[PDB]
Design a protein around this ligand. Structure first.
Ligand SMILES: [Mn+2]
Length: 278
């Protein structure tokens, strides 16, 4: 069976939904861990060597740890677009605020279901290319999976319409909501823009607090994959309660709510809608 490697639990989850049990999947970044700067383990390095097909997010996700993914994929002598593929190829890339080049991209594409579908299309493409036997299975799973996602996106484009503008702000630690914001029309603020930066300096915190004091935002959120101290601080300083943990860089641990791309997207939608209705 096809030996596949996903860099993180999101891509891995999407992959499972395409490949079912037709492949040997290994997911590098453990659930709940930050996929921006990860130190691949020996099993990770071995599985990547043996892999027929490696999926990563690209658009500047796995290029901290000073390019851990690049170095992973160097050492394993793998070739871009032959052995490994960025599953974000195709997304309308959004860039980080201020800096603006290759390495100014914001990686968080998947917080837009349409992009989640693009990922699935890319994942399915490559699975088929590399394992033509199961081409049909994949495409069938794909069509089903993207329907599931598309429905959900279709249903959610409205969720936020009734939120009073001055409450309508998603606040999370990392600025991982740019795509979400664009897709569902709810602005987002944050303590640090991307996890590769210092995380939760008194300055970032002050900046966010001062922005928040100007709002009537009822709830802050905190992602499942970051230290929550900084946001607790924001919470305390603005007296805005942290309403829910949500999912940016990772799906939930096995069995919890949100433990798949689809249901983490569903969870986020729901919790944020409730959180901001409060
Ligand atoms: Mn992130």
């Amino acid at each position: 069976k096809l030996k596949v490697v996903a860099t993180n639990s999101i891509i891995a989850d999407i992959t499972k939904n395409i490949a079912g049990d037709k492949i040997d999947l290994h997911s590098i970044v453990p659930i709940g861990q930050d996929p921006h700067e990860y130190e691949p383990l020996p099993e990770d390095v071995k599985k990547t060597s043996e892999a027929d097909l490696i999926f990563y997010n690209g658009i500047n996700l796995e290029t901290g740890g000073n390019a851990w993914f690049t170095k992973l994929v160097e050492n394993a002598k793998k070739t871009e677009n032959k052995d490994y593929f960025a599953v974000s190829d195709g997304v309308d890339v959004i860039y980080l605020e201020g800096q603006n080049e290759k390495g100014k991209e914001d990686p968080h594409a998947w917080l837009n279901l349409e992009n989640g579908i693009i990922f699935a299309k890319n994942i399915a493409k490559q699975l088929s290319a590399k394992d033509p036997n199961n081409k049909e299975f994949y495409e069938k799973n794909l069509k089903e999976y993207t329907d599931k996602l598309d429905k959900l996106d279709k249903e959610s484009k409205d969720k936020f319409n009734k939120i009073p503008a001055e409450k309508k702000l998603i606040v999370t630690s990392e600025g991982a909501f740019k795509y979400f914001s664009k897709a569902y029309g709810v602005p987002s603020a944050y303590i640090w823009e991307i996890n590769t930066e210092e995380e939760g300096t008194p300055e970032q915190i002050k900046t966010l607090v001062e922005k928040l004091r100007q709002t009537k935002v009822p709830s802050l959120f905190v992602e499942s994959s970051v230290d929550d101290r900084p946001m607790k601080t924001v919470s305390q300083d603005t007296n805005i309660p942290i309403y829910a943990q949500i999912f940016t860089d990772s799906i939930a641990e096995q069995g919890k709510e949100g433990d798949s791309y689809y249901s983490m997207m569903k969870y986020n939608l729901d919790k944020i809608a409730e959180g901001l209705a409060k």
